[PDB]
Amino acid sequence: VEEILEKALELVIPDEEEVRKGREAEEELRRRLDELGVEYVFVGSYARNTWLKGSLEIDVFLLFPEEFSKEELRERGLEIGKAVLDSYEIRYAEHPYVHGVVKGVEVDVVPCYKLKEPKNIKSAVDRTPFHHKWLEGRIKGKENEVRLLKGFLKANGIYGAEYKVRGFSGYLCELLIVFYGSFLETVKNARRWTRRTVIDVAKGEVRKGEEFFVVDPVDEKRNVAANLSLDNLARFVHLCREFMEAPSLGFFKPIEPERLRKIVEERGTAVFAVKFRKPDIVDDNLYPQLERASRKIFEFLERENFMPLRSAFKASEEFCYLLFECQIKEISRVFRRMGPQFEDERNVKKFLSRNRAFRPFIENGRWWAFEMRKFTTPEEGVRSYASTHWHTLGKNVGESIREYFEIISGEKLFKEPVTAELCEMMGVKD
Template identity: 25%
Template sequence: MYGAEIAKQGFSGYVCEVLVYYLGSFENVLKRMSKLKNNEMIGESPRKFDSPLVIIDPIDRNRNLGAAISIQNVTNLILIARNFLKKSSISYFKEKSKNKIPVELAKNTLVVSFKYKKRSDDIIYGQIKRAASSLESQMNKEGFNVLRSDAVAYDETNASLLFLLESLSVSKNEIRTGPDVFSSDFSTKFIHTNSKKSKLMWTDKEGKLQSLQTRRYENAKSYLNDLIKNHIGDSGIPKGLRPDFKTGFKIKSGKDKQSTSVKKSISKLITTDETAFSTN
């Protein structure tokens, strides 16, 4: 949560100083955060900004320091502030070890690892975060429900994309929903396009066409492998990363043996942050 680099998208040291400057003390910062409203502005500016937390730079009132802070870090701070104010503890200021990996969730986690030509952290993290987001969207479209995703770069030339799924496998059947029958041209086109692929076609209670078909992929790992290996141009992976993927990549389960850096990232992805979600 602390750190302005793109890998963390958190609160920089300067942002922390500005918050204390505006609010008077660390305790007041926590009190304000605990009651924060979406898009709330701290400081004054003639401009409107679109970010979960707006922090006006006192040196440049047209600059929003909160723009670079992710929604996850903002909401985590809100939860942690509420818990700390209820029951303060020095443990909040100590980094907790997160190497324990819940097996039940790890088996539904996919890790796509590859090597890349060395480049700055800002560039590689921008690329791998976009890649993870795009692949998440592609898997969701294919019927695999991705719950969370993340990306990590480590050891200067290694990177991994992480995906926690509801399940790695889905039913071999899928339903394609078409237009309502009253839309003549569209319904005719839907029937023509899907008739040969359909096991069953019918109209539902809303008058919309339904087609029961065999799903192309039942396994998320197989789908992801085929997408990256054979259809990378349609994957949404940034062009700057494609040559790196073409030199080779591996897809493993979260329960397989991983490097220390990846193991930490998996743990972060699939474990609950007790400081934010404590019930004490």
């Protein structure tokens, strides 16, 4: 293992030229910011030298007096960000900031309140300067351990707390390194994590809770792992077990429509997608909506007895796809409806008063009716469901589905940019 981690360091540590680029970009930022007479602080991974090789982003925090309105922070912050970056983008879900580039390096310029105590925070980002002060004199010397953890997580698709990933944030990685001492110790101990593991770095303690909870040393009410999904927690624990069993440098490194067609026909399942235009909204808004829409349709498919197996979704540049595989390609038109016990004649009368095609029957002490379905395939079902229940499939996703959707299968489906997702959904290997 020790030999592998040596090799892995070459993948996670920035070389002298990349470090040089960062420092020069930092120096230029300070120069631009000092010219404006702005109050700022460097925070995050650049300021701690815990950033992953090839993935540098400098965080500059603009410190505003607590009295300022939320609207002043965005106006003033966006104004400063734009004046200070070579090129810029402004795109966010709630908390305002400017993304840009200085001397080839990515930068976020972020307005925040200058608080004493990261308690009753005023903006969403107010803890961040306190994270830095806390980590400052604790992370020193353990930089490459953090970089190993980040690289391990990134190579396995579970790095980042954003909705798209629902994984481990960079800050969480730093806290784990402070807690365990090193990447290897983190990985060894994570093998024994449960869905009820509470890690409290400030108290130097692991206990049991209602949920997986890593308490922010800056804010004991804050779960740093709040947005780590159960399944992704499960993935990391499993990965840690595998790595220790058979340590591989491959842990640190990240089909033709014809074969996919044959696999689907081998499975004998109904495979299809709902396709609609992607709403022009940020990822952090879009993905939870794609998750909701996918779940609502899945649940419809289950209560309709199509026996859905799994679901998946994918957003391309212009379209979104909700993907489903079902055990039932076609169900009978007739089904049975449960009626009352033979005993209560009031409800039996009412149950039998319905005009039906097929004459109700007594079985095991109760009345039952044959009834007719409006659809017999999972595709016909989803068409009905998505057309009438658009409004429950996410604010923007539901509105887009209301404007246009189509259900795709077969040769037509395997031509869509969804092949990676389909393979993962069906556990296709090789």
